[PDB]
């Protein structure tokens, strides 16, 4: 609730980076009810509830937040670059994972070679998609690249998780942290892409 | 090394259940070099090295073992039932996971229904395979059921891991422990099955 000064009483969840000692500001876009208002965490009514663990890693480098009727002044009141960078970092992680798995395979069959080849193919395809989306954002404005953004949001995590699984299978180590990150970062976007594709086909005809 | 009393100097790894305070006996089948000899853990030279963590779970319910020239007398010197039970327990775990996922899906689309149906199909097929292998062991001796044992060793973990992934995806809880167990319990058996199948085809002709 962001009901009108204005009061914001509600319960947060999965708020990444909420446990840092140097975390003061906080941006909440809560209930055309979309109205994002800054809320300092030192204000009364804000209190961290409990830490959330993913696969048993505390992720010291996901504490729940509760906002019980915080009083803030009216003064205290997009996704393209974020998605692009969040896909590029994952691509780099997958490249490092593939390097590690190749080195381990050499140090210690046909199936491992097939796994390496498939991983390289997937990495190249995902990198090309990410760069195409970034260039589309750069050149032809930022409102004409939602389709590519949804596409890179769909494609990358599945192939990267598959690569991580193949690597940890070959291993039978930093790869643990990479798998943790890839699993943490892991189907409505497919419906959105289908809607956009149908609209495009209707427009073309 | 189990070289001939006899001395057994070597390093163990991934020894499950080695950290229990009530763990005294130990069976090691080390270097027709297959000669399994009991080795009490209180004997000099046996010392636990470090605990092994899988996905960041200590599994209180995998400490490394080191045997540095343990002196034991000569007095101190199959897999079918083990594989059958290890597949049956996994099948039961998958059934409970499917029950939990169905209850959560009801409490909170077509894709979830498709996931439920596929999970049920896989569970039924795996249960049938396990029961067939067990009955083959029971009736026609224990030396004529290696093929089915390898088959159940191949089939079950993949489908059960897929079911666990679908469940944790639907969830967006005991399921964490189930996923931990299914991942911990997760390709040479395929080659063995191919060899046995080729031998059977050659014999039939």
Automatic annotation (TrEMBL), chains A, B:
Coiled coil: none annotated. Residues 78-195 form the Acyl-CoA dehydrogenase/oxidase C-terminal domain. Residues 1-61 form the Acyl-CoA oxidase/dehydrogenase middle domain. It is found in: Mitochondrion membrane; Peroxisome. Acyl-CoA dehydrogenase, that exhibits maximal activity towards saturated C22-CoA. Probably participates in beta-oxydation and energy production but could also play a role in the metabolism of specific fatty acids to control fatty acids composition of cellular lipids in brain. Belongs to the acyl-CoA dehydrogenase family. Homodimer. This is Acyl-CoA dehydrogenase family member 11. It comes from Mus musculus. The lineage of its organism: Eukaryota, Metazoa, Chordata, Craniata, Vertebrata. The gene is Acad11. The chain holds residues 521 to 775 of 779 of the full protein.
């Amino acid at each position: 609730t962001i009901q009108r000064g204005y009061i914001v009483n509600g319960k947060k969840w999965w708020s990444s980076g909420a446990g840092n000692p140097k975390c003061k500001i906080a941006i909440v876009l809560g209930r055309r009810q979309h109205s994002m208002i800054l809320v300092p965490m030192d204000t009364p009514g804000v209190e961290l509830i409990r830490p959330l663990s993913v696969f048993g890693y505390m992720d010291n480098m996901h504490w729940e937040v509760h906002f019980n009727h915080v009083r803030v002044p009216a003064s205290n009141l997009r996704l393209g670059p974020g998605r692009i960078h969040h896909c590029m970092r994952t691509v780099g992680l997958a490249e490092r994972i593939l390097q590690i798995m190749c080195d381990r395979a050499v140090q210690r069959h046909e199936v491992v070679a097939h796994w390496i080849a498939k991983s390289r193919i997937a990495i190249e395809e995902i990198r090309l998609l990410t760069l195409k989306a970034a260039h589309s954002i750069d050149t032809l404005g930022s409102a004409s690249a939602r389709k590519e953004i949804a596409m890179i949001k769909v494609a990358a995590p599945k192939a990267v998780c598959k690569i991580a699984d193949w690597a940890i299978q070959v291993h039978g180590y930093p790869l643990a942290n990479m798998y943790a990150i890839i699993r943490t970062l892991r189907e409505v976007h497919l419906s959105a892409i289908a809607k956009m594709e149908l609209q495009d086909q209707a427009r073309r005809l």
